[PDB]
Each structure stands twice: as structure tokens, then as C-alpha cells.
Design a binder for this molecule. Structure first.
Ligand SMILES: CC(C)(C#N)c1cccc(C(=O)Nc2ccc(F)c(C(=O)c3c[nH]c4ncc(Cl)cc34)c2F)c1
Ligand SMILES: CC(C)(C#N)c1cccc(C(=O)Nc2ccc(F)c(C(=O)c3c[nH]c4ncc(Cl)cc34)c2F)c1
Ligand SMILES: [Br-]
Ligand SMILES: [Br-]
Ligand SMILES: [Br-]
Lengths: 262, 274
């Protein structure tokens, strides 16, 4: 089949912000869409490769908790077209609005995020930038994982595993670094706070997290955080990469502990 | 690319069986639905039905179309899609006495029109649009599916069709009822079915509620002597929907509007109501 959308069909609307490359707009194409466009005369080879990589990855995904890819265009500009997400990111809800979710809902958000991540890893896709700003709460209820960059909101230091934040080597990312980022998301859900909220300097966070002398303060977890969720968070946040669990185990554990409440 | 290896899906509760095969709830990176088409070695018919359904579904990526997720071929031919949670529009309107506000009735029409506009843009004729194939997922997003697609298909254009397709008679365009072409289905017959959905939304009733048997409906819709009673729309029915419904139900198929136009009209109404 083919996902190329002919020029002229999409009506490009309000500008939302910068994406992971290019600029994101709300658009119309058989309903609402998002359109991420590279607004340049001619793309560099690097820009073309980034576009191709993103289309290549997105076209491999069909899951309710992954942003729905819908098509692309290459002329007159490189564009990636996806569903429109209605609502706000998890970051916005937790930290900006400080939305007060019930524990059942917090655990369901964790569950849905774990399903999306389990799916990506099953498809051999590393996210590399999981964080609450990249977890969209569509229609205030269905998690959509994306890589929205600035459209939703250095901006990712708090979710970086120690091996990533240490800049250990030229590509320190793995499924296990995604797991660590998911541990930080669990921290955000279960505490309603960002980690290191009282550390005022980013360089200090970089040095101390990387050395293992700073880690998230698990005393901040809400009093009705289930013990099994606290333990799972601690496993996801293990400082040594190879000690962290895989997503199939994470997901199974969340599904179990969710049943136990309900 | 979309083949799911055997062993990965945990096939759970059986939800329903019929001419479509058997649908189960399952687990595979979260909830899924799994439709199995055979139990023993598949016939060539079953295999071609499977291939066609995967081929149609893999052309679709739209929020208002049931999300295809994958397939398996052993030990059973299986089509894997998202799980839908909730009830169909038919169940709401006709089995549950759900009372939707007008803004919500129009949003249902709007999301249905988006999905149908999309299918038609992809050159896909649905062939069985009706309120029971409009799923109100999490009561907030419409998912159009074909939740009763029969695997075995008759070769004979005639009168035993209407027994098996008894669940769809109310949504069949007159030229579909008459079967004067070997395949009388078109984009325009999908539009007619959408007209009947609009009727359901704006009246809260099925068409032909006082006609007491299907044979009479087949005969009279085919002859042009029975039409839905458009006067029965509820007092809050927008004027735009009265006109639009009548246009979708036009007897001459080429006089019905296309989905781009239908969608644009409903989007304008939704703005006016908001
Ligand atoms: C598969 C994976 C690894 C994940 N996960 C991945 C890899 C690379 C990129 C993306 C990725 O998500 N791309 C992407 C493309 C086009 C867009 F418009 C947007 C985009 O900002 C939006 C798409 N709907 C939206 N509704 C609302 C708002 Cl405010 C923004 C958007 C977008 F983020 C995802
Ligand atoms: C694109 C088009 C023309 C449309 N529109 C079309 C053509 C042919 C077939 C289908 C089609 O939809 N197939 C299909 C395949 C697998 C399934 F499990 C189910 C299925 O009953 C369900 C899929 N989730 C479900 N949640 C809950 C419940 Cl109760 C049932 C299901 C299913 F209906 C759709
Ligand atoms: Br695809
Ligand atoms: Br009857
Ligand atoms: Br009937």
C-alpha cells in the first residue's frame, strides 16, 4: 500500500510549535490531523534522512497507545501527518495544571503507557525520549505516546538514565534507558512531582545522577501508592542498566497490581 | 510486516460467533480483538476472504476506523484489531434508550462522516454501514467497523440474500434492494445508509417503525413507494440536518451528495452549535 498524501489535500491551520524537526500545525484532512512540516527551500541530506527515519518508524506502528501515523508528503515540503490529539500532555496535567487524578486513573495511565512501550520494544523501536511531555492524554483518557518535542511544552535531563546523563559513550541509549525514563514517569504519577524539585542547578543534577549520588526521593509517593507500584518504580530506576526489568515484565506487573485494587 | 507470530496473543473470552467466524477478546501488548475465520484447515474461500479483509484493513489509518493491528495464519487464520469498549450506536439508540444531547448527536454524525470520507478517499466502499457498525468507543470516539462480515458469500443475485442480510435491510439503498446489477453497491449506496443513520440520530427511531414485515419493506422500497417519515425528527433537529438527510436518501443514486460535502456541512453545523 501507500501513505503518500497528494499535494493540495491538506488544509494547514494553526501553528502549534516546533517538533522534533520542523514545525507542527493543526490541519484538516478527512477530519482533524496534525502536520509536521519542514519549512525550507531544499532539505539537507541530514533532514531528508531524519524525515525518512521518522516515516519508517511510524509506519511500523499500529497500536492504540502510540500516536497514529496517517501519511506523508515530500513536495513542496517534507511533511508527516498524524492524528490530532485533543487535550494536554501528562506533563501539563501533573505539573502545570496539577490535575488531581484518582489512584485508579494514575495506575491506568501507567498501564496504558506500559502497553505502548511494550509494543514499541516488541517492534524493535527504542523511543529515546520518553517523558511525561511525550505522553498525550487524548480526550483526557487514552494515552498516546509520541515524540512531540516542543509542540507539547535539557528538557529531558530528568528522565535520563545515569548512563545517558553521564555521556558515557556516543550512543548510550537502550531499551533499559527507556525503562528508566518510564520509572521517572511512574515517579511523576505516584508523587505528582518532578524528581529533584529542590535541586536548583542542572549541572549538579547531571553530575550527581550520573555518579549515583542523587536519585529520586521515593518518600514523596502518595500514601495510597500501592506497594507493588513503589517496588516496580524502584526496579525501573535501578542505577545499573542491566538490573532494570523489560517491558513485558513491567506490563504484566502493572496489569496484576491494577487487578488487585479493582 | 503485520504478521503476528504464533504464541504471542493470549486468546481470552469468546465474545460472539456467527457467519463472520468467532471474535475473542485477547491480550497482545494490551487489549485486542481477535477474529478467527476457521478451525480446521482453511478452504480456498476462507483463505481468500482472509486475504481480502487484511488487504482492505491494512489500507486504513484513521481515528474513526477500527484500528487493524495484525494477522496470524497458524493454527487459525486470525485478524487482530484494537478492542472497542462500549456499545454500538444501534445498541444505544434502539436497545438502551440512551438520550443524547443534540451536540453529541451531531458529533456522532460528524465522526461517522469523517471515517466515511476517509474510506471513500481510499476508494473503499464499506457495503454495510448501519448503526450497529458504528461503535461508540469509550463513549467519545466513533469507530466504524464491519462487525458482521460473512465469510461465505453467495454467488446468486436474489431473494435468499435478504434473509442472511435481514440485519441490514433498513439501511439498503433502493438500487441495492432491487439488485438489478450484479454488484449494486457504490459510494452512493454508502451515502444512503448514512442518511438512514442520520434518520436514527435525529428521530431516535428506526425508519419504517410501523411496517410490520421485511418483505413489505423490500417490495415497497424497491418500487419507490416507501420512504422514511422525515417529519418524525425531534423538535430540536437542526434545519441543516433535515435537508442533508433528505439529500442522502435520494432515490437516484447520482443525486446523493458525496462525503466531502456531507462532512463539510456537518462540520459547519457543529461550529454553529458550539
Ligand atoms: C514512534 C515514536 C518513537 C513514538 N512515540 C515516534 C518517533 C518519531 C516521531 C514521533 C512523533 O510523534 N511524531 C510526530 C509527527 C507529526 C506530528 F504532527 C507530531 C505532533 O507533534 C503531534 C501529532 N498530533 C498532535 N496533536 C496535538 C499536538 Cl499539540 C501535537 C501533535 C509528532 F509528534 C514518534
Ligand atoms: C474497513 C471496513 C470497511 C470498515 N469499517 C471493514 C471491512 C471488513 C471488515 C472490517 C472489520 O471491522 N473487521 C473486524 C476484524 C476483526 C475483528 F475482531 C472485528 C470485531 O468484531 C471487533 C474488533 N474489535 C472489537 N471490539 C469489540 C467487539 Cl464487541 C468486537 C470487535 C472486526 F469487525 C472492517
Ligand atoms: Br500500515
Ligand atoms: Br419480518
Ligand atoms: Br427488521
Amino acid at each position: 500500500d501507500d501513505w503518500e498524501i497528494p499535494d493540495g489535500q491538506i488544509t494547514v491551520g494553526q501553528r502549534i510549535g516546533s517538533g522534533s524537526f520542523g514545525t507542527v500545525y493543526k490541519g484538516k484532512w478527512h477530519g482533524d490531523v496534525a502536520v509536521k512540516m519542514l519549512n525550507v527551500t531544499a532539505p539537507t541530506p541530514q533532514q531528508l534522512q531524519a524525515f525518512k527515519n521518522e516515516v519508517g518508524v511510524l509506519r511500523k506502528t499500529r497500536h492504540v497507545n502510540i500516536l497514529l501515523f496517517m501519511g506523508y508528503s515530500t513536495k513542496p515540503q517534507l511533511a508527516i501527518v498524524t492524528q490530532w490529539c485533543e487535550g494536554s500532555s501528562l506533563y501539563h496535567h501533573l505539573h502545570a495544571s496539577e490535575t488531581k487524578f484518582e489512584m485508579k486513573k494514575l495506575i491506568d495511565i501507567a498501564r496504558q503507557t506500559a502497553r505502548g512501550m511494550d509494543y514499541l520494544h516488541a517492534k524493535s523501536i527504542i523511543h529515546r525520549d520518553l517523558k511525561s511531555n511525550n505522553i498525550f492524554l487524548h480526550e483526557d483518557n487514552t494515552v498516546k505516546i509520541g515524540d512531540f518535542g516542543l509542540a507539547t511544552v535539557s528538557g529531558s535531563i530528568l528522565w535520563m538514565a545515569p548512563e545517558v546523563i553521564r555521556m558515557q559513550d556516543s550512543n548510550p541509549y537502550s531499551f533499559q534507558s527507556d525503562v528508566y525514563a518510564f520509572g521517572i514517569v511512574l515517579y511523576e504519577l505516584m508523587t505528582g512531582q518532578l524528581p529533584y524539585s529542590n535541586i536548583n542547578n542542572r549541572d549538579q543534577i547531571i553530575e550527581m545522577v550520573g555518579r549515583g549520588s542523587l536519585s529520586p526521593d521515593l518518600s514523596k509517593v502518595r500514601s495510597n501508592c500501592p506497594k507493588r507500584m513503589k517496588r516496580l518504580m524502584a526496579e525501573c530506576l535501578k542505577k545499573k542498566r542491566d538490573e532494570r526489568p523489560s517491558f513485558p515484565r513491567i506490563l504484566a506487573e502493572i496489569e496484576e497490581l491494577a487487578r488487585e485494587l479493582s
